[PDB]
Ligand SMILES: *[C@@H]1O[C@H](CO)[C@@H](O)[C@H](O)[C@H]1NC(C)=O
C-alpha cells in the first residue's frame with residue numbers, strides 16, 4: 001500500500017554508536033518479526049551477516065545467529081526480502097540470492113552493464129557501486145552504467161526468478177549520491193543535506209526536489225527504505241539510527 | 248583532453264568495458280584515477296608515454312590479457328588491481344618501475360612459487376598490502392618487503408613454509424592462509440614467532456592435525472583454525488596469547504583437552520568450538536570446573552558432549568560425573 005509521495009525525512013531514533021564507520025542494517029519487511037540483520041563494512045573482508053532477535057537485544061549486542069556468506073560483499077547495498085538475503089558479490093556485477101533458513105545460495109543474477117568496484121560507487125565510496133532497494137513494487141537494483149555515463153540507473157528485479165523486469169535511465173550521477181532508496185516506484189536521491197532528485201518510474205519521468213535530509217553526522221554510509229513500518233534504516237558515521245518519514 | 252573511445256570526468260578516466268586490446272595514447276596529464284578493467288589489454292598495449300602521468304594514484308586493470316607483470320606504469324602509483332589476469336613472471340624490473348606502490352592485488356592470476364624473480368620486492372619499499380588469493384603458489388616467497396602489513400594467500404596450494412620467508416615481516420598484521428594444503432610438518436619451527444605486530448592469524452580449511460605452537464602473543468587478537476582435522480592440542484599452543492580475544496576451532500576431530508592451556512588466554516572474549524566429537528570422561532572433568540569459574544562476559548559455543556551416547560547432546564558445564 002503506497003504511503004504517498006515523500007514530503008519529508010526526519011531523524012527519529014538513535015540506537016547506538018558502532019565501532020565501524022560504514023555498514024548497513026535492515027529488517028525483513030515481508031516477515032512479521034522483530035529480527036534485525038546486521039553487517040558492518042570492512043573492505044575486502046566482508047562476508048558475514050549477524051541476526052538479532054529484537055530491538056532491545058540488538059542494542060545490547062545480543063545476537064541470535066551469524067550467517068557466513070558464500071561470497072564477499074561490495075558496499076552497503078545488501079537487502080533482506082522474504083527470508084532471503086540479496087547482496088553484491090565482490091569484484092562482480094552479480095547479485096547473490098541467499099536463503100537464510102536453509103543457509104544455501106539458491107541463485108544468482110547479473111546486473112547488465114553495471115559499473116562496479118569503485119567505478120561508480122556513491123560519494124563516500126566503499127564499493128557502493130551497487131545498492132539494493134525494497135518498496136511496494138518489489139525488488140530493485142540501483143547502479144550506474146557506463147552507457148548512462150555513471151548516472152543512476154534503476155531496474156526492477158524479480159526476487160524469485162532473478163530476471164530483470166524493466167529499466168529506467170535517470171539523470172543524476174551515482175558518484176554524487178550519498179546514498180539512495182525506493183518508495184512506490186519513486187526514486188529518492190540523497191546528497192550530503194538534501195534529497196535533490198527523484199525519479200518516478202511509473203511515468204518514466206524524473207524531477208528535481210528539495211527535501212531535507214539529516215546531516216546529523218557526515219559519513220552517511222547507507223540508506224535503505226522499509227515499506228512495513230515506513231521507516232529509513234540509516235548508518236551515518238559509526239552511528240546506528242532510524243529516520244522517520246513525512247507523508 | 249581525453250580520447251574519443253573513453254570518457255573522462257574530473258580526473259577520473261573511464262576506459263573500462265570497451266573491448267580495449269590497447270591503451271589510448273592521448274591521455275590527460277592531470278589524471279588521478281584510471282578505469283581500464285574488462286578489456287582485452289595485454290602487455291604490449293602499454294605505451295612508454297604512460298609512465299609520465301605523475302599524478303595517477305589508482306589503477307584498475309582487472310580482467311584483461313596481461314599475460315605477465317606490466318611495465319611503463321605511472322611512476323607514482325599507490326593502488327594496483329591486477330586480478331582476473333594471466334600473470335606469470337614477476338621481475339625486479341617490473342616492480343622497480345613503481346617503488347612507490349602501497350597496495351597490490353593479484354587475486355585470480357596464474358602466479359606460482361618461483362614465478363617471482365628472487366629479490367623483486369627489494370625495491371618496492373612502500374608496499375603494505377599484498378593479495379595472492381587464488382594464485383598457483385606452492386610455497387611462500389622469501390624476498391618480501393618488510394613494509395608488508397597484510398598478506399592474503401588464500402586458495403593456493405601451499406603445503407610447506409620455511410622460517411625466513413615470514414621472518415622480517417614485523418609490519419605484518421594480518422596473515423590469511425585459507426584453502427592451503429598445510430600439515431604440521433609443513434610448518435616452520437618459529438616461522439610465526441617473529442611476527443611481533445601480528446594481529447590476525449587465519450588458517451582456515453587446511454589439513455592441520457594439531458594446534459600450532461610458538462605463536463606470537465604480543466598483539467594476536469583473533470586466531471582462526473576452522474575446517475581442519477585436528478586431534479591434539481599441545482600444552483604450549485595457547486601459552487602467552489594473552490591478548491587473544493577471539494579463537495575459532497569449528498569442524499575438527501577434537502575429543503579431549505589437556506589440563507590448563509587457557510590459563511594464558513586472559514583477554515579472551517569469544518570461543519567457538521562447534522562440530523567436535525567431545526568425549527566426557529575423567530579427562531574432561533577439569534573443563535566443567537573451569538567453565539563455572541568463568542566470568543559471564545566470555546561466550547562459548549559448540550561445547551557439548553557427543554560421547555558417551557548416554558550424555559550425548561548435553562552441555563558440559565551441567566554434568567555431575
Ligand atoms: C609495530 O607497529 C608500531 C606502530 O606504532 C611500529 O612503531 C613498530 O615498529 C612495529 N613493530 C614492533 C615490533 O613494535
Ligand SMILES: [Ca+2]
Pocket residue numbers: 077131132133179180181222223224
Ligand atoms: Ca541504498
